RNA sequence: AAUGCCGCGGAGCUAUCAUCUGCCGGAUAACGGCUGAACGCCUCUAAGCCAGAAUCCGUGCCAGAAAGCGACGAUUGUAUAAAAAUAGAGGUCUCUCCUGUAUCGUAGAAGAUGGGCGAUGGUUGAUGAAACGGAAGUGUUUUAUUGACUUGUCCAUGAAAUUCCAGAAUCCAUUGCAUACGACUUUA
RNA sequence: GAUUCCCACUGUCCCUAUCUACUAUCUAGCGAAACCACAGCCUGGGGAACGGGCCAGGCAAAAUCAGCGGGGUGGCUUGUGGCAGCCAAGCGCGACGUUGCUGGCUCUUCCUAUCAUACCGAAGCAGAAUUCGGUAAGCGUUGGACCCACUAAUAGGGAGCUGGGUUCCUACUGAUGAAG
RNA sequence: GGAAGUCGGCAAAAU
RNA sequence: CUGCCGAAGGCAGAAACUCAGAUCAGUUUUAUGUGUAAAAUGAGAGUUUCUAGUGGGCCAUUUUUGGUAAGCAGAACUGGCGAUGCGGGAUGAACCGAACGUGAGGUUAAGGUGCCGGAAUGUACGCUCAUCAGACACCAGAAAAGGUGUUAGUUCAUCUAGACAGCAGGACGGUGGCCAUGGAAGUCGGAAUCCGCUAAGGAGUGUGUAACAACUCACCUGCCGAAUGAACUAGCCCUGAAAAUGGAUGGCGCUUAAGCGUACUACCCAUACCUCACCGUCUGGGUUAGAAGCUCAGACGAGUAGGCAGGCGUGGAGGUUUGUGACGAAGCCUUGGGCGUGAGCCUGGGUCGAACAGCCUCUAGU
RNA sequence: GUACGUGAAAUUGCUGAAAGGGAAGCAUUGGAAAUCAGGUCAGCAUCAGUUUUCGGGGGCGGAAAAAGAAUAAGGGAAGGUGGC
């Protein structure tokens, strides 16, 4: 007998199964298509949720209802502090997929990242990478071998990179390393490129700017075990099938937000960055009191749009859009006119203890 | 027609039925067979037939968990695996060790690209199809059912057949300074009376 | 594939059931 | 004062009661055509080709085989490799295929001990250095130095009663980005 | 007392969200019972009764934890009525024709026999709006007392509950987990 | 917003 | 526990005795009309008597009447099932073989020889391409038929007096025949539809035009050089509708088949057939040199109800064994050994502590 | 050793051996390990019974095979050769 009143499934097929990711840090399941046409140019960057605000924008939206007038939108900020660059990874292209053909690594190789490599670094004698250190050292012809190798072989090209947790206010100290895709140029090109850039460190200013639109990924906030009613958003003989909504995990599963837009790429050494052309009003994007469970911001930061998955302080990872999208909400300007900054713990009602302090009287302290 | 260790057949103009019934009667003798070059075998009836019946294959699926559901393989060398151990007792012991007598690839890897590749007459499209019937290739069935390394392979056999020819040209120059010196050698004709 | 709508195979019960009428319908025509 | 009653009430949770985000490559069906026979004309079809639906298959997105795998780090006689077509191929106008019943190899008390004659070769072992091979490089060539054996041919010795087959991680501790408990994310 | 009406009130509802206590969770101690041929995956078949054992397939990797309760009879059929006559391809029939008359509340998935959306062909199709037909099941097919609105449309079917009417195991969902 | 739920103001609020 | 006989929808067996017969036959000839009577082949044939179990039903077969959209219903015979395992049909109560003691070897039946699967990817000749082929199995429901799919045929047609087709042309003039009309000239529309010319130009096959006009065929001439056309039948192929999760010629797969049809070899194996050994039952011959025995030979072997016969084991009683036992009875455990088809029996090792067993009879709370 | 003669089975613990991918049990054949036991196991020749698979020789039959070859008559022609 047929279903008398019909709906829409009440989930969605395609991000099942409602388990638990097996990862904290956000990967990269797709690199944007690479063209030899274009020379060297990365495409990612791994960011820290520190918290989000609203500004206020002039939207220049042809066509629109509210062409030229005063608009107010949420907006992420994501603390981004330069990533040192400290190894490159060959990948050969095979009938089986890409395989991982070789990896070289930097002479100097900082404790943050070497905290990656233990769940205990003080008990540790330290002895990772001393012997690849003392070859580095001895005979750097063997490591010309494997770059030879990867660019004789090897058809996609990516540089290791880790974070430098310690100038974000965290209280982790083990920094989060990833591989970054360098996309463009023939393989010695990019394979000139990494070594150039060992040991040194790429900042967002040279990854994004300001106003393309990029695919920020990451896990989303964890909401424990939950009944059918929150996990899927429910109301002849058989046995049970995949499609009926059960009871299990709601939260923290590997998510891909699309078409985020960049507001305004911040840098952490000048204090104007929290000021617009229509609000001068020294400030930083800090909001009064400071982030609420995070902390100061105090290196480069980028704004987007919208909200991304995942709670404060944690890992987020920026990559390049795959595919061009000439939307006109993507190709458009933005053109900031004022950040709140006010305290986000409780109802704040001033943007700066400066000029909190001429509304408010002499206070006794 | 004698009892080898390692037999490599290079599945080129072959006849996918035919020549994994001869395959499965193999392993079941105690041979090792490596069946190379998997996306050139060839099966009987129209592509746009082959890729309805396949799309049916498809169809198979368990209504609760299809993780658990049927397997489907899209690559040509798992295709014949496929039609292999269709035609073995997979179920018990004899047959699964049967199943890991074989090794059926895509395209010819290097250690089986040095060595020498025999050819199975009974399944031999040439020598089996009547001229004027329409056929397919599994390597482009795979491509349109969801196979997706179909230019890696043919870019990496457009590399061995460069390295093959030069190697055979040496190979055959070498034989043709050796081809010199037989006739050279006189008792080639002296005592030859005996045929050689 | 079996490539059909209908199953080529077919059940005991349907397969005797034709030698079961078949048989009749020469009896009808005689 | 079993949350006595009321107002406000951060944080957290939450609301299409709040905000954000939701993408492109092939193959086709109906159908419209190109060339073109069958059938000396014609013809969208028979061989082929083009355009063509929210369709099918991929890309993208989620999971990651807990018996799929790679890279990195530390480490207390087992003889034989072109390719392609089969209503055609290759070699020097000419020649060959028409299957490996072919080719390489093949003696020795399981491979002994010597003597010549003829050639600078073959088997090559050991090291030592060059090049090449990344699809799973499972190896290939090039040598060099030597130590060997050198059936190439011709001679002499012994065989037998084997006398008819057999440095790390974890617990305790810590964290709250997580959490029924495990697990996880940090510190230690 | 029942019914109706107007006003009034409110989480019955749109549309659920939040807060507290207990239970469930883990732990120390104590500690049962029902039930029990043996058990435990699905598809098609096994004449039936299809079943879990049989046949042919998909498959198949220890040990486990918390949930939720699913599992304890034609190859039928469909779109075209009944009587009489005239032909007559043919073998007394005789086909098509031709002429004579009066049950509703929520739920997973599948099928196309398509209501809407996509693309096409035909029509006095000028345009707009529209009719019929083809491929097409990807995606939708409502809110209220056959009625009246909305809607692009309100298409047809297959495989936990209540009203007026007769006087263990396995599955599904999450969570660990020894091991080359 | 105010029975639009349900066979229906079942149950709470208006006192 | 084993063996033998073995049904029933008045039977099977037991005992008592005839005749070495023309005495009977689920039979066929001969004669007379399925009846009767008097040659073939086979068999030893019989009569009275009493005494267990059953008197059901399913499936198919050939003979008829009543029937209808459509099946269906009621009779008689026949068998199979039932009491029946085995080989094959993928598997199965009714389909094809084959009736069963324990084994060795050989050979087959039915069905098969691409792989699963033991056996020819044998030989020979044809047919078929299916964007939802076939392996199907009187192809019987849809079923009547459709198809510019293919291969064969059957019957009529013209054809080097030039076939069909193709291009070049003619395809006319009385006449715009007559009613019919805004306008109809063959072609909106009403009867034909005549004539001069021919080799032919239809009061006209269609398009078209308000009407015209113009093109086309159906009809002829020029070039062009050989076969061509129409109507039916047969085989395969498509179609001849069917839904609701995944999906089945058994699967994989197969397209000069591994599909369809035929022909010929070779090959595979059942509990079947043949040769041999062995077990048991029955039957027959012989046996005065455990007679309850010995010996030779042949045939035979499913088995429910039922009938008959011979054995194993348990408690107790009489007889016997100069019977066993504290130097270990009975009991119990055991990966030890042996015997018997079997019921069961003996025994080694360990434990154990006081009774126990063989043989012949008797007996039963066996 | 009184929870006391002997002390079985169901069931349980330990040790040793072995097996294990959605059953387990059982049967047939044999290997592997363990264990026990008594002449054991082979090869060939000559035979007997059964049987399978190749080869040779010789008769006898048909139209006393049909064909065919070689060699004499005549006839006919082609899918017509040399010639024309």
Redesign the pocket.
């Known amino acids: 007998?047929?279903?008398?009143?019909?709906?829409?499934?009440?989930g969605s097929?395609?991000?099942?199964?409602?388990?638990?990711?097996?990862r904290?840090r956000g990967?990269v399941?797709?690199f944007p298509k690479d063209d030899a046409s274009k020379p060297v140019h990365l495409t990612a960057f791994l960011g820290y949720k520190a918290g989000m605000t609203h500004i206020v924008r002039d939207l220049d939206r042809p066509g629109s209802k509210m062409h030229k007038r005063e608009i107010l939108?949420?907006v992420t900020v994501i603390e981004t502090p330069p990533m040192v660059v400290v190894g490159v990874?060959g990948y050969?292209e095979?009938?089986?997929?890409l395989?991982?053909?070789?990896?070289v690594?930097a002479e100097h190789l900082s404790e943050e990242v070497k905290?990656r490599?233990?769940?205990?670094?003080?008990?540790?004698?330290?002895?990772?990478?001393?012997?690849?250190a003392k070859k580095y050292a001895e005979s750097t012809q063997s490591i010309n071998r494997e770059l030879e190798?990867i660019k004789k072989?090897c058809s996609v090209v990516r540089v290791l990179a880790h974070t430098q947790i310690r100038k974000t206010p965290?209280?982790?100290?083990?920094a989060?390393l990833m591989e970054i895709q360098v996309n463009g140029g023939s393989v010695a090109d990019k394979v000139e490129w990494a070594r150039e850039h060992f040991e040194k460190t790429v900042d967002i200013k040279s990854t994004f700017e300001q106003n393309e639109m990029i695919d920020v990924?990451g896990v989303t906030?964890?909401?424990?075990?939950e009944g059918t009613?929150?996990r899927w958003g429910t109301?002849?003989?058989?046995?049970?099938?995949?499609?009926?909504?059960?009871?299990?995990?709601a939260?923290?599963?590997?998510?891909?937000?699309?078409?985020?837009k960049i507001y305004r790429i911040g840098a952490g050494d000048d204090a104007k960055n929290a000021s617009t052309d229509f609000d001068a009003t020294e400030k930083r994007i800090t909001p009064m009191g400071g982030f609420?469970?995070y902390g100061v911001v105090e290196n480069d930061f980028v704004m987007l749009?919208?909200?991304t998955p995942?709670?404060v302080?944690?890992?987020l990872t920026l990559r390049k859009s795959?595919?061009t999208?000439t939307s006109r909400?993507a190709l458009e300007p933005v053109s900031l006119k004022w950040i709140d900054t006010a305290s986000?713990?409780?109802?704040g009602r001033f943007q700066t203890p400066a000029e909190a302090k001429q509304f408010l009287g002499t206070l006794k302290k | 027609?004698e009892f080898?260790?390692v037999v490599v057949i290079?599945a080129?103009?072959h006849?996918?039925?035919?020549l994994?019934?001869?395959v499965?009667?193999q392993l079941?003798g105690g041979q090792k067979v490596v069946v190379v070059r998997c996306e050139?075998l060839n099966?009987?009836?129209?592509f746009?037939?082959n890729?309805?019946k396949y799309?049916?294959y498809?169809?198979?699926?368990?209504?609760?968990?299809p993780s658990?559901?049927?397997?489907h393989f899209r690559a040509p060398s798992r295709?014949f695996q496929?039609?292999?151990?269709?035609?073995?007792?997979?179920?018990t012991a004899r047959?699964?060790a049967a199943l890991e007598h074989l090794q059926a690839?895509?395209?010819?890897?290097?250690?089986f690209?040095?060595?020498?590749?025999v050819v199975v007459?009974?399944?031999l499209r040439?020598?089996?199809?009547?001229?004027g019937?329409?056929y397919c290739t599994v390597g482009r069935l795979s491509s349109?059912?969801?196979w997706?390394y179909n230019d890696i392979?043919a870019k990496?056999?457009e590399?061995?057949?460069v390295?093959?020819?030069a190697?055979?040209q040496a190979?055959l120059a070498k034989q043709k300074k050796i081809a010199s010196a037989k006739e050279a050698s006189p008792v080639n004709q002296k005592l030859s009376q005996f045929g050689? | 594939?079996?490539?059909?709508?209908?199953?080529?195979?077919?059940?005991?019960?349907?397969?005797?059931?034709?030698?079961?009428?078949?048989?009749?319908?020469?009896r009808?025509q005689k």
């Open positions: 007998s047929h279903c008398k009143f019909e709906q829409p499934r009440h097929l395609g991000f099942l199964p409602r388990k638990r990711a097996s904290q990967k399941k797709a939108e949420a990874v050969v095979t009938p089986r997929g395989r991982s053909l070789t990896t690594w905290r490599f233990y769940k205990n670094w003080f008990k540790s004698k330290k002895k990772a990478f001393t012997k690849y190798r072989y965290l209280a982790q100290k083990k989060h990924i906030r964890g909401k424990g075990n009613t929150a109301k002849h003989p058989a046995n049970v099938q995949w499609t009926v909504a059960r009871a299990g995990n939260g923290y599963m590997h998510r891909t937000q699309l078409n985020s609420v469970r749009n919208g909200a995942g709670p302080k944690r890992v795959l595919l999208h909400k986000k713990f409780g109802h | 027609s080898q260790k290079d080129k103009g006849l996918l039925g035919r994994a019934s001869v499965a009667k079941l050139e099966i009987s009836g129209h746009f037939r890729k309805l799309l049916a498809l169809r198979k699926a368990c209504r609760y968990n658990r559901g049927a397997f295709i496929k039609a292999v151990r269709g035609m073995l007792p997979h179920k047959g699964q690839v895509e395209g010819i890897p290097p250690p690209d040095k060595q020498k590749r007459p009974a399944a040439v020598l089996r199809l009547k001229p019937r329409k349109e059912v969801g997706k392979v990496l056999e590399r061995r057949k390295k093959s020819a190697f055979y190979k050689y | 594939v079996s490539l059909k709508k209908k199953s080529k195979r077919r059940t005991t019960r349907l397969r005797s059931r034709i030698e079961k009428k078949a048989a009749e319908s020469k009808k």
